[PDB]
Each structure stands twice: as structure tokens, then as C-alpha cells.
Amino acid sequence: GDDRELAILATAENLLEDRPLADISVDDLAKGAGISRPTFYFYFPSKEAVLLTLLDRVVNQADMALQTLAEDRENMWRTGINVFFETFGSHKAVTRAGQAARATSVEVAELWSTFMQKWIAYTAAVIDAERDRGAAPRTLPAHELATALNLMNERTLFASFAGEQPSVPEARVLDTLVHIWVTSIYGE
Amino acid sequence: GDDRELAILATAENLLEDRPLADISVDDLAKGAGISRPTFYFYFPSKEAVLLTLLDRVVNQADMALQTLAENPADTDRENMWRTGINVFFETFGSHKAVTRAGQAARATSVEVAELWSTFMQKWIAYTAAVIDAERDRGAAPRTLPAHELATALNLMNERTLFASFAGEQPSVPEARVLDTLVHIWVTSIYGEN
Ligand SMILES: CC(C)CCC(=O)N1CCC(c2nc(-c3cccs3)no2)CC1
Ligand SMILES: CC(C)CCC(=O)N1CCC(c2nc(-c3cccs3)no2)CC1
Structure with missing residues (x-):
């Protein structure tokens, strides 16, 4: 539910410690958040x-x-x-x-x-x-x-x-x- | 020769007044400096x-x-x-x-x-x-x-x-x-x- 939104945010902050936003894909964020790409698109447009x-x-x-x-x-x-x-x-x-x-x-x-x-x-x-x-x-x-x-x-x-x-x-x-x-x- | 370089620089500074670098093409810079595109590339790689x-x-x-x-x-x-x-x-x-x-x-x-x-x-x-x-x-x-x-x-x-x-x-x-x-x-x- 909301814990899915929160997992996407935490994944993004974690990956940004390592690489710029340019080198992180939606696929990247979806995986670390434990969701599919189209589910990601439910919570965020980009x-x-x-x-x-x-x-x-x-x-x-x-x-x-x-x-x-x-x-x-x-x-x-x-x-x-x-x-x-x-x-x-x-x-x-x-x-x-x-x-x-x-x-x-x-x-x-x-x-x-x-x-x-x-x-x-x-x-x-x-x-x-x-x-x-x-x-x-x-x-x-x-x-x-x-x-x-x-x-x-x-x-x-x-x-x-x-x-x-x-x-x-x-x-x-x-x-x-x-x-x-x-x-x-x-x-x- | 060197006046071509200076014209390309002056053209770029002028166009930068109105638009960002992303909206200026090499063609734009060549045009303003009075040269062709391949001539531009002789003076600058980009x-x-x-x-x-x-x-x-x-x-x-x-x-x-x-x-x-x-x-x-x-x-x-x-x-x-x-x-x-x-x-x-x-x-x-x-x-x-x-x-x-x-x-x-x-x-x-x-x-x-x-x-x-x-x-x-x-x-x-x-x-x-x-x-x-x-x-x-x-x-x-x-x-x-x-x-x-x-x-x-x-x-x-x-x-x-x-x-x-x-x-x-x-x-x-x-x-x-x-x-x-x-x-x-x-x-x-x-x-x-x-
Ligand atoms: C622009 C950001 C990156 C930094 C902002 C910053 O360093 N500040 C902004 C406001 C600040 C301020 N403190 C106060 C205080 C009131 C009561 C105790 S501090 N009022 O304004 C302190 C310095
Ligand atoms: C980072 C740039 C935009 C900063 C430029 C700046 O405003 N400066 C850099 C050095 C400057 C300086 N002036 C001097 C002087 C020596 C003798 C008369 S002024 N020494 O350092 C004054 C402020």
C-alpha cells in the first residue's frame, strides 16, 4: 500500500548514494522496492x-x-x-x-x-x-x-x-x- | 582564419543571450559566423x-x-x-x-x-x-x-x-x-x- 511508496523512496535514496539519477532506471527502483515496473508507475509517473x-x-x-x-x-x-x-x-x-x-x-x-x-x-x-x-x-x-x-x-x-x-x-x-x-x- | 574563430565565438555569445546551449545548433553557429558546418568543425570539435x-x-x-x-x-x-x-x-x-x-x-x-x-x-x-x-x-x-x-x-x-x-x-x-x-x-x- 503506502509501505510500497516508502520502499520506492528508500530504494531511490539508497541508489543515489552510488550513482546519479541518470544511471538509475525505473526497473532499478522497482526491483529494490520488490514490485513490477507497471506497479511502480501506479505510485510515481517517473x-x-x-x-x-x-x-x-x-x-x-x-x-x-x-x-x-x-x-x-x-x-x-x-x-x-x-x-x-x-x-x-x-x-x-x-x-x-x-x-x-x-x-x-x-x-x-x-x-x-x-x-x-x-x-x-x-x-x-x-x-x-x-x-x-x-x-x-x-x-x-x-x-x-x-x-x-x-x-x-x-x-x-x-x-x-x-x-x-x-x-x-x-x-x-x-x-x-x-x-x-x-x-x-x-x-x- | 582567426577572424573565423572570433566570429564563431561572437555568434555563440550572441545566441546564448536568447536561448540555452541546447537550443543552439552547430548549423546556427556556422550560419552566424558566415561559414559552412564542416568549416566550423575545423575550428571546434563541438x-x-x-x-x-x-x-x-x-x-x-x-x-x-x-x-x-x-x-x-x-x-x-x-x-x-x-x-x-x-x-x-x-x-x-x-x-x-x-x-x-x-x-x-x-x-x-x-x-x-x-x-x-x-x-x-x-x-x-x-x-x-x-x-x-x-x-x-x-x-x-x-x-x-x-x-x-x-x-x-x-x-x-x-x-x-x-x-x-x-x-x-x-x-x-x-x-x-x-x-x-x-x-x-x-x-x-x-x-x-x-
Ligand atoms: C539555505 C539553507 C541551505 C540553509 C539555511 C540556513 O543555514 N539558515 C536559514 C535560517 C536560519 C535562521 N535561524 C533562525 C533562528 C531562530 C531561532 C533560533 S535560530 N532564524 O533564521 C539559520 C541559517
Ligand atoms: C568566485 C568569484 C566570483 C569571486 C570573485 C571575488 O569577488 N573576489 C575574489 C578575490 C578578491 C580579492 N581581491 C583582492 C585584492 C587585492 C588588492 C586589491 S583587491 N584580493 O582577493 C575579491 C573578491
Whole structure:
């Protein structure tokens, strides 16, 4: 029933650890899920739709975790960046394949865009509240500062996870981001 | 002869303004450059090699311009020094948006493009780190993060942020605000004690 959908998703994430989406066939996903190819087509219209569902789940998991946190200043930001570091860090294969699919899937590009706008708006609201209580100085427009900081974390977190040359080592990427966020949000 | 190569490059950059590489054929590039298809193949093995060459020229132009800046005293306050350096990339890539966009896309599918980008990123990060170290050495910047790791995150920020702005991504910093936004983050993060 639903456990069949879940088996297809788990198979896909498992195979994506090994190869790109280009080198995984519906036949591949059907076999690992223990179903036939036409049964697979009952649950998903394409291998692309499988990835989109995985990414949606990972992105919603980071988002929910950030809402949970939301509901010292350096430590507050570190805890928030850490939600993304851990969530996407725990699903590296999906992260890497989802980021690649942005260039070829409008639904993936729109999903990413929607959540980026949400995370940027949350970041700017917190900066504004810090400015309101007199802990942060009124320097750049908060939304513009939030946008560049979130774009930084996207590129840098994901370069690290994929082992890009160049990238910050994964064991140093959290301290690196937190320094840049704290000095740029609080720095006069 | 060489003017044929340059006409093929100019044709490709022009067509990239309106359509992606996938919607440009070799026939299109030959037609715009005033040559036949087999003549095109004399100059380039593929439409991919044309783009790789365009990107190589753009990336080398930014790089030569950063070298020119670096070799001057250029005496200026610290914020102004970083602004002038970020401005080289803002102007150079900003002047070739279609090539920048297509070349960033082609990183996914071309090992030669991926390796080109990677080579210059490492060079620009190393120059940034060396400048941060010299600043630390003279006592203008505090010793906070490892200079190379700070340099890496800052350059990766500029790559994603400049290129999101150029492409009009949602979300992105408006192109008229992006220079000021980057310079603020570089200055506070390089000089900020906290
Ligand atoms: C763009 C993704 C890959 C990374 C997103 C990221 O690193 N963030 C986005 C929002 C963040 C934020 N945290 C908060 C906090 C509120 C209360 C504790 S953290 N508000 O916004 C932290 C950094
Ligand atoms: C990854 C590309 C798009 C980043 C380009 C970038 O904005 N840079 C790279 C290096 C830059 C740098 N400037 C300098 C200067 C030396 C003397 C005046 S500026 N050293 O490193 C400034 C920012």
C-alpha cells in the first residue's frame, strides 16, 4: 500500500548514494522496492517524480526543525545553521541530486525557490527583531543581508557535502558559517 | 582564419543571450559566423568546446584584471580595497551574463568546464587568503578563523550571490544592491573581532 511508496523512496535514496539519477532506471527502483515496473508507475509517473518527493521530504524536515527552534546570540545562530547542516548532511545523496535537478526540473527549481524565500524571510525577521531590541546595528537592509547569507550557506554547505574542490572541510563548515553570520549581523 | 574563430565565438555569445546551449545548433553557429558546418568543425570539435572557450576567455579576463589590481599599491581604505576587488568580478561576469549563466550550467555536464572553474576558484581563494594574512600580519585584521577557510566561504558566497543576481533568480539580491551587500559581509567578517 503506502509501505510500497516508502520502499520506492528508500530504494531511490539508497541508489543515489552510488550513482546519479541518470544511471538509475525505473526497473532499478522497482526491483529494490520488490514490485513490477507497471506497479511502480501506479505510485510515481517517473524517476524524476521520485527525486522530487525525496527532496520535498528533506526540505520539509529542515523547515519543520527550524519552526521548532523558532517557537547567547552566536549560539542562537549556530543552532539555526545546525538544523540545515544536520538535516541536509544526513541526506547527502538526495541533496546533491536535488540541487542538480534544479537545472532540468521546473518543479524542483520552484520547490527550492519557495523554501529559500521562506528561510530568507525568517532570517530577516530575526535580524529585524535583533535590530529592534538594540542588539544589532542598522547596517544593510535586513532582507538583502539575509538573502546573501542564505545563498552563502546553500553553496558552501553543499560544496562541503559533495567534497568539491574547493570547499571548506565538513568538520569546519559550521564554525566558518557562524563566524560570517555573527560578524555580518552584529558588526558595525 | 582567426577572424573565423572570433566570429564563431561572437555568434555563440550572441545566441546564448536568447536561448540555452541546447537550443543552439552547430548549423546556427556556422550560419552566424558566415561559414559552412564542416568549416566550423575545423575550428571546434563541438558547440560545447565553443562555450568552454568563451568561459575560458571570460574567466581569464577577470583573473588578469584581479592581477592588475594586486600589483598596484592602489592606496585606499580597507573597505574600498575589497570593494574594488569584488567589483572586478561583478563587472567582468556582469558584462558577459549569457556566458556566465551557460558556463555555470555546463559545470554539471562538462568535466573540462568543471575543472576550469575549480582551477580559478582555487587561485582566487588563495589570493584572498594571502591578502587576509597580510592584513593580519600588519595588525589591521584579527586572527579569528583560518584565513583559507574564511576565504573559501566568502568566494563561494560571491559565486552564488553574483550569479543568482545576474540571472534574476528568485530569490536574489537586486543587481544594483549586490556590490554593497557583498562588501559589507567581506569587511565585517575579515575585520570583525566579533
Ligand atoms: C539555505 C539553507 C541551505 C540553509 C539555511 C540556513 O543555514 N539558515 C536559514 C535560517 C536560519 C535562521 N535561524 C533562525 C533562528 C531562530 C531561532 C533560533 S535560530 N532564524 O533564521 C539559520 C541559517
Ligand atoms: C568566485 C568569484 C566570483 C569571486 C570573485 C571575488 O569577488 N573576489 C575574489 C578575490 C578578491 C580579492 N581581491 C583582492 C585584492 C587585492 C588588492 C586589491 S583587491 N584580493 O582577493 C575579491 C573578491
